């Protein structure tokens, strides 16, 4: 039956959106991090820790979406 | 071109017409050209270097100060020292103890 | 063994529901459609955690002295100081209820979330084989009900504070007039105030449930899909993240409860 | 997922825990550290009064 | 055919839009947080607490979509 | 049957759009709040109050949109 | 079968667009209001009162959009 | 007669796009208006007149779109 | 036959979204890095190191997306 | 699928996570040690100072 094709499309949309968000938000955050590290070059180890702290919060939902897309693509289809 | 002044509270350091200058601004190195928009910034200690009319090179060291720009005028209000350590608060103590003793 | 990963995931997302009427163990293969079937697994682990919290706090409170502090007492003094400092930061009233409520919320929610770090199959395998229970899932927080019951209790507390400290007159006044204060907007004001008021606790409960549920399902997928030799390289980076996740989520629940109660009262 | 009457039993458990903790748990705690701070402060106050 | 795959596509839409919104909003918030921390490197705990308040407020509503998408995928489909 | 099946997709679209709008708006608002609290640290409890005041205004339309999507996916579906 | 279903679909897209617009506009307006509050905290009682007037103009149109969406959902069915 | 159902979707898309455009434009204008009122609070009644003059232009196309969508929704359908 | 044809669109959407996300995020990060290098030319070797540290996080998800798009285009076809 | 292999892999991953937590999440008790040192030292020294 033809039903199998649509699962690939749904996984494609979900993972593409997840990658769009995971790239853009991390890019903005890293740009601010670099801007702040340029000013105070001695504070890099602290800003770098806080950057990781917030970056963990950023990508979580994209990670969920990517994992679900992998599941839909391989296990279901 | 614009007329550059270099002055301090004690003395006039330099005055003359200048084609361009290199100066260390508060947040980074800065270059000034004739007709530059009005600008105000402190300057960190270091060299300010100058080309007078006919592009003659001149270098001046400054302990610090404030740089500002006006239509046709550039004025550097340099000061004697950084002053950021404020060691003279210790100098004020002996004035008190010697008054008490 | 022979199993489809889809069904392995299916079992783990099921609960030891039991009929309150007939006292009968529901099974994961066929769910009945009767409302009163308590989901036992989350509640059983949930009150156990509260009992452990109460036992430890009493076991330290029963002996603490102002002399040389012990190594064990210091953690409890630190958590008491942290909760008290947060309350004093975001609450100025005389109500003795706020601080112990926040302390209980923080500690209990932290304990519930911690269950997720454990191996997903350990306790369920034990319960199925040694005991014989049809189903089990051991993180209480992943239950929507535990989250929604706590959020609705906090909303009840908010209503009580609005009626008592803020005042019922000061509640009708705010609902009708604010934010636009004009009689033309009063019908709109009522709708906006009600929508935001109901949005707050729903946001608390569903935020906590979403976090715990989406961590538990990630662990279950990692266990079910990947071969054993490769599981660690994706499981370990996730538990380290989820430790910070559970700490942050318990802190968020406590602080947001404090904020809502303080805004209702004062 | 699926709502159930578990919403009610946990509402009983929550209120029971809240009542028991509010009554017994909190009041004994936080006394000792306050006693430490008051001892340090009143010893300082008394010593400075005697110094004056 | 029409039953399962449309549900999968709906879940994919939910959990792509939720990932987009949460990632972009958290990146925006974290940029201002990291900018503040470079200006006042001492006040970091207070600013990060306020950031935690706002981060919870942001994250609250996309998680509704995330959980409902998981429900639609597994319980429904 | 397709009639009820598509309702899930309609609710998915509605609540995904609601989530993206709410997340982005609240992220911008919180970023401005964080920057303000970083300029004037002594002022934080006032700005936080104002932020809650405006956030109650922001979320109302996304909140009702998500509620109506939940209605269409549970009561209707 | 598909008449009421498409009615719900149209209501869904309408209300999603309305929620997006309202959330983004109020986010921008509240961010600028927060910045103006931050600059001069003692002026907040006036700036808040002007922000309320402007936010009423912001809210004017998403509310007729949402009202028509509710009409489509409930009355037309 | 299938003709009726597509007209509701055609009205819905028009009104949603009009709501998005008008709400974001009015928020952008009002944000600068509020910042300007923050800077020079005595000039507020003049800036309000200027803001109204500009707002009369922003809503030119959006109000035409909303009127035409409402026309399509009732008179034509 | 649709089982073969539709897979190319499912890969096309993935490899468009991944490219848009990676391009926007890398553009923003590179712009911030360029501005920091312009202001502080001495720190260029340090800012470049930190830029390459951060950039490997942006590409994490879009590279999964592009690899899965290549897989969908070629292996399953 | 075999369920034994899943239990093996989950055990492996939990062992590795426990090791990582013990060597990177446990140390905050070291931060907690400073509180003990401060409390003991300040209390004893301040009481002695007041009495003297």
Numbering used by the authors:
A (entry chain O), E (entry chain P), F (entry chain I), G (entry chain Q), H (entry chain L), I (entry chain N): 3 to 79
B (entry chain H): 3 to 103
C (entry chain a): 4 to 269
D (entry chain X), J (entry chain Y): 1 to 52
Paper lines:
A key component in the generation of cellular energy is the F1Fo ATP synthase, a biological rotary motor that converts proton motive force (pmf) to adenosine tri-phosphate (ATP) in both oxidative phosphorylation and photophosphorylation. The enzyme is based on two rotary motors, termed F1 and Fo, that are coupled together by two stalks: a central rotor stalk and a peripheral stator stalk. The central stalk is comprised of subunits ε and γ and rotates during the enzyme’s catalytic cycle. E. coli and other related bacteria exploit an internal subunit, termed ε, that can sense the environment and inhibit the enzyme under certain conditions.
Masked 3D classification focusing on the central rotor highlighted sub-states in which the εCTD adopted either a condensed down conformation or an extended half-up conformation. The maps generated for each of these sub-states showed the position of the εCTD, with local resolution estimates of 4–5 Å. However, due to the likely high flexibility of this sample, it was still difficult to unequivocally assign the position of the membrane domain subunits (a, b, and c subunits) in the maps. To obtain clearer information in this region, a refinement that focused on the Fo motor was performed and produced maps of sufficient detail to enable fitting of the membrane region. In the half up sub-states, no density for εCTH2 was observed, however εCTH1 remained attached to subunit γ. The sub-states of State 2 showed the best detail for the two εCTD conformations and allowed the c subunits to be assigned to Fo rotational sub-states based on their interaction with the εNTD, assuming that the c-ring remains bound during rotation, which is likely because the interface between the ring and central rotor has a buried surface of ~1200 Å230. In the present study we observe that the Fo motor rotates two c subunit steps in the clockwise direction (when viewed from the membrane, i.e. the synthesis direction) when the εCTD transitions from the half-up to the down conformation. Torsional flexing of the central stalk facilitates the majority of this Fo rotation, while the peripheral stalk flexes to accommodate the remainder. When the εCTD is in the up or half-up conformation, the εCTH1 binds to the γ subunit, clamping the central rotor together. This clamping would stabilize the central stalk in a closed position, increasing the stiffness of the rotor which, in turn, has the potential to impede enzyme turnover by decreasing the flexibility of the intact enzyme.
